[PDB]
Design a protein around this ligand. Structure first.
Ligand SMILES: [Mg+2]
Ligand SMILES: [Mg+2]
Ligand SMILES: [Mg+2]
Ligand SMILES: [Mg+2]
Ligand SMILES: [Mg+2]
Ligand SMILES: [Mg+2]
Ligand SMILES: [Mg+2]
Ligand SMILES: [Mg+2]
Ligand SMILES: [Mg+2]
Ligand SMILES: [Mg+2]
Ligand SMILES: [Mg+2]
Ligand SMILES: [Mg+2]
Ligand SMILES: [Mg+2]
Ligand SMILES: [Mg+2]
Ligand SMILES: [Mg+2]
Ligand SMILES: [Mg+2]
Ligand SMILES: [Mg+2]
Ligand SMILES: [Mg+2]
Ligand SMILES: [Mg+2]
Ligand SMILES: [Mg+2]
Ligand SMILES: [Mg+2]
Ligand SMILES: [Mg+2]
Ligand SMILES: [Mg+2]
Ligand SMILES: [Mg+2]
Ligand SMILES: [Mg+2]
Ligand SMILES: [Mg+2]
Ligand SMILES: [Mg+2]
Ligand SMILES: [Mg+2]
Ligand SMILES: [Mg+2]
Ligand SMILES: [Mg+2]
Ligand SMILES: [Mg+2]
Ligand SMILES: [Mg+2]
Ligand SMILES: [Mg+2]
Ligand SMILES: [Mg+2]
Ligand SMILES: [Mg+2]
Ligand SMILES: [Mg+2]
Ligand SMILES: [Mg+2]
Ligand SMILES: [Mg+2]
Ligand SMILES: [Mg+2]
Ligand SMILES: [Mg+2]
Lengths: 77, 46, 62, 93, 102
RNA sequence: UAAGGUGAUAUGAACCGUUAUAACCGGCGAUUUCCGAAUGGGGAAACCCAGUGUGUUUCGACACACUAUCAUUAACUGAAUCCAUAGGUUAAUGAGGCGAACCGGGGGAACUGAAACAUCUAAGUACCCCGAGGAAAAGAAAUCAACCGAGAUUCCCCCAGUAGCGGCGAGCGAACGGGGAGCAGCCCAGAGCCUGAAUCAGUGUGUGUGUUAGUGGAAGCGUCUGGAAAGGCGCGCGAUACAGGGUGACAGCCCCGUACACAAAAAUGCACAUGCUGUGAGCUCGAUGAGUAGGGCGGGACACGUGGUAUCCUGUCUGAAUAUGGGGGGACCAUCCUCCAAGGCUAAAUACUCCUGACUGACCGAUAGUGAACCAGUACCGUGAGGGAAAGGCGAAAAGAAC
RNA sequence: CGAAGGUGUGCUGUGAGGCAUGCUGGAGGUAUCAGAAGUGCGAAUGCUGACAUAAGUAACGAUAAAGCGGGUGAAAAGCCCGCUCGCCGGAAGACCAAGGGUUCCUGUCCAACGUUAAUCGGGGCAGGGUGAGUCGACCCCUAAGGCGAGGCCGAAAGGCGU
């Protein structure tokens, strides 16, 4: 599914509002990308389905910190 | 002339049988409704 | 019965069970040929088999 | 292959009729009601131990119980197994 | 718990046989009793070929409501009522009028 | 608990029992085919076919046990590729499926209303989906207030159809404050000192008490009519019992009850007391939740439709300060007041009824009341989802009509 | 020593109605003054049931066709036996499959069913009847297609697939 493995960001629903204020149901999808992260501690690359926001979270916290959250959640990588 | 009901037990069971109902979520809902109604026959069987 | 059968051993109860099952067979043959006047005997034999089997069960895993 | 407890429960009743009488007189065959789940091997062994006679061959069929209508509601008699137990030339019972 | 029992001498309180006495022959689960010489009927019994049995008008006791009979207190010659008490480790019946065990 | 019994149509047959293994009622056990989550594999449900391990005064074939998937944990094993990791096998433990309503969450209509219709309405309704509990959710202030003060959450009554929102149409519709039900507060973001010190859960025992069988339970007779008396008439009696039902017509005193008084071998609920395993109390010195708050863009939520619009959530792009600090007080600024976000837990008052027991009704009484008083979710119809009836009353007693 | 209800009659009220009483019925009814409403039917091509009408009318289902003798029986055009006559014969015969499910055979019965009578029946009731190593199924093998450990994908449900 279109779910960020880091933040949990998923498709949300809302409306397209026209100039005439006609509401039509829509979705806002997360900016998802499958990215290979180098994990020094495991001497292996880990491919995660992450939003650009989640990628910034990994830049701040570090991949080991983020992967530890995934283990605690039971979420495999 | 040729009428709409042309029998076949194999096609009867494959299309409406117990196992066919059990195979999908919506078919298990058919069985659940029929059980709540208190139906004697849930499906056509042997 | 039930108290009298409880005193018997596992080997003894297995013998009585075989005897009751032989009697059950002979009574069924007698009933089926229309030769059994005492219809009540079938229920007595059937419930004795039940008593023997119940006691064998409480002696095997207790 | 066998067990006495099983053999004692396998034979249910002699079946009486004109066909059963003629099968005995002409072919030395006894007609029985046997347990529904009884196999030809079980019926052979049970007749040999309990009736003390030698069995040549066992033939079996399943009889479908008749349905009777009682107004709007139906009744159904039980299906049962019939055995044609042929005994060897030397006849006893 | 039952106030009227098989073999008791009872007196009829209600019906065609009011005042008459008789022995309880059987007590039925319906709350009815058969009492000897009481509530007689003359049934037109149909013939049964399976006996080669002919038909016949048969006189028999018909069941009477148990509430329609009273325990007969022979000692007082009167209809009585039953009470219950424990004498020894056993429950007993007693006549309400004279407090005597049955 | 008992003098009667072997459920019904439903007799009859053969029997069981009467002072205590007849039956009947309740507690705990045993047995519990096959299908069904169905779980050894398969499958057109109730069937077809196996592997492995065991048994055979007969060690052929049958009987019996185990063998599904996934998750966590452990042991053995083990690639590309040296280590490693993946993978593989086995074992332990758990899950799965079903089912009323209430409950939290993910999605989410339209008819309709606007006397047309698109903003708006219907309505976060119907429905679909996920999950949970006896309740759920919420919850101990970055909350209000107004310079006086209040002190978590939930629910009820007001405030008030007010202030507002609104093609300022149709409609939508607060809060502040007041009266009430109920009330309870805690822990982590860490170390030391003293150590198992408050609490909570699992669970042995003990007592109280509740449930699942039960026990006792007052007092009326004569006469008349009548097929029959409970009715009329006469005279009695009980009542902490004249609730109600039955009995050949309407019974306080005939029967079952009712008021009142009692009872458990066994299992179980709730309390306290107490044993045990695990958890930690108190004190001192600290620490104080960052891709967060804030912002731009698009939406959504707030009674509040972008409006002069504060507050909340966030799909996208960004991005602080650090108690000499930060949030809020409905654009915004100053002053002042008030609170301390980015961690978590928590009972009550609140919502509901598939079911169990007791009781009640100016509710129905067979075209009514359930669709169904009755063998009804049946018969019947339809490929199917599904739809879905009609149908109660002899008599007090079958004495159901011998001949 | 006769309630409600039903069916008559008499009196009474402006009327909706009321009272009395004969007969039927067989156990319930309720003054008065208040109280509450599922409170009044001729219509809605109203709803359910019952019963008329047309009318003893149409029809009795292929125009292949019957006749007679004897029988059984309460009754015979129709059933049984017999002799003829006629019809089909690439079927209107025989055998499979599918589908049905006892309709099969024997005895017995005739209400209803059978477009008539019915002694007859695929109708009622009872009993009987289906016997496999080599006929079919199961079984081994695959087709289209289905399902599908892991997996890939998707708000959830799910979709696809090794
Ligand atoms: Mg053979
Ligand atoms: Mg066969
Ligand atoms: Mg008592
Ligand atoms: Mg399976
Ligand atoms: Mg299986
Ligand atoms: Mg297979
Ligand atoms: Mg290696
Ligand atoms: Mg579940
Ligand atoms: Mg409109
Ligand atoms: Mg639960
Ligand atoms: Mg909670
Ligand atoms: Mg202050
Ligand atoms: Mg409102
Ligand atoms: Mg208040
Ligand atoms: Mg208070
Ligand atoms: Mg009493
Ligand atoms: Mg009467
Ligand atoms: Mg903080
Ligand atoms: Mg904020
Ligand atoms: Mg303006
Ligand atoms: Mg201000
Ligand atoms: Mg907090
Ligand atoms: Mg209840
Ligand atoms: Mg009804
Ligand atoms: Mg009526
Ligand atoms: Mg009335
Ligand atoms: Mg009246
Ligand atoms: Mg009035
Ligand atoms: Mg009318
Ligand atoms: Mg009119
Ligand atoms: Mg005409
Ligand atoms: Mg004419
Ligand atoms: Mg004509
Ligand atoms: Mg006639
Ligand atoms: Mg038939
Ligand atoms: Mg025939
Ligand atoms: Mg006819
Ligand atoms: Mg027939
Ligand atoms: Mg899978
Ligand atoms: Mg697939």
């Amino acid at each position: 599914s279109r779910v960020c493995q880091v933040t949990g960001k998923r498709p949300v629903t809302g409306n397209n509002r026209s100039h005439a204020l006609n509401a039509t149901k829509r979705r806002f999808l997360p900016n998802l990308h499958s990215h290979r992260f180098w994990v020094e501690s495991e001497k292996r690359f880990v491919t995660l389905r992450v939003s650009a926001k989640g990628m910034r979270v990994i830049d701040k916290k570090g991949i080991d910190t983020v992967l530890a959250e995934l283990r605690a959640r039971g979420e495999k990588y | 002339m040729k009428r709409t009901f042309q029998p076949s037990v194999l096609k009867r069971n494959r299309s409406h049988g117990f196992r066919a109902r059990m195979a999908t979520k919506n078919g298990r809902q058919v069985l659940a409704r029929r059980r709540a109604k208190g139906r004697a026959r849930l499906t056509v069987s042997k | 019965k039930a108290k009298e059968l409880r005193e018997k051993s596992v080997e003894e109860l297995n013998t009585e069970l075989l005897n009751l099952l032989r009697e059950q067979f002979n009574l069924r043959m007698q009933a089926a040929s229309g030769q059994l006047q005492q219809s009540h005997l079938l229920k007595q034999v059937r419930r004795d088999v039940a008593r023997v089997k119940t006691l064998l069960n409480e002696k095997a895993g207790a | 292959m066998i067990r006495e407890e099983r053999l004692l429960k396998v034979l249910r009743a002699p079946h009486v009729s004109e066909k059963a009488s003629t099968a005995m007189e002409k072919s030395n065959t006894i007609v029985l009601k046997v347990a529904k789940d009884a196999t030809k091997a079980e019926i052979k062994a049970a007749v040999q131990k309990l009736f003390e006679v030698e069995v040549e061959v066992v033939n079996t069929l399943v009889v479908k119980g008749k349905v009777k209508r009682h107004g709007q509601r139906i009744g159904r008699r039980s299906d049962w197994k019939k055995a044609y137990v042929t005994l060897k030339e030397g006849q006893n019972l | 718990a039952a106030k009227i029992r098989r073999d008791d001498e009872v007196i009829v309180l209600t019906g065609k046989d009011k005042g008459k006495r008789g022995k309880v022959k059987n007590v039925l689960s319906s709350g009815k009793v058969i009492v000897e010489g009481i509530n007689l009927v003359k049934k037109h019994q149909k013939p049964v070929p399976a006996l080669n049995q002919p038909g016949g008008i048969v006189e028999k006791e018909a069941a009477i409501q148990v509430s329609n009979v009273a325990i007969f207190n022979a000692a007082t010659g009167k209809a009585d009522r039953v009470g219950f008490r424990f004498e020894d480790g056993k429950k007993v019946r007693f006549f309400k009028s004279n407090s005597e065990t049955i």
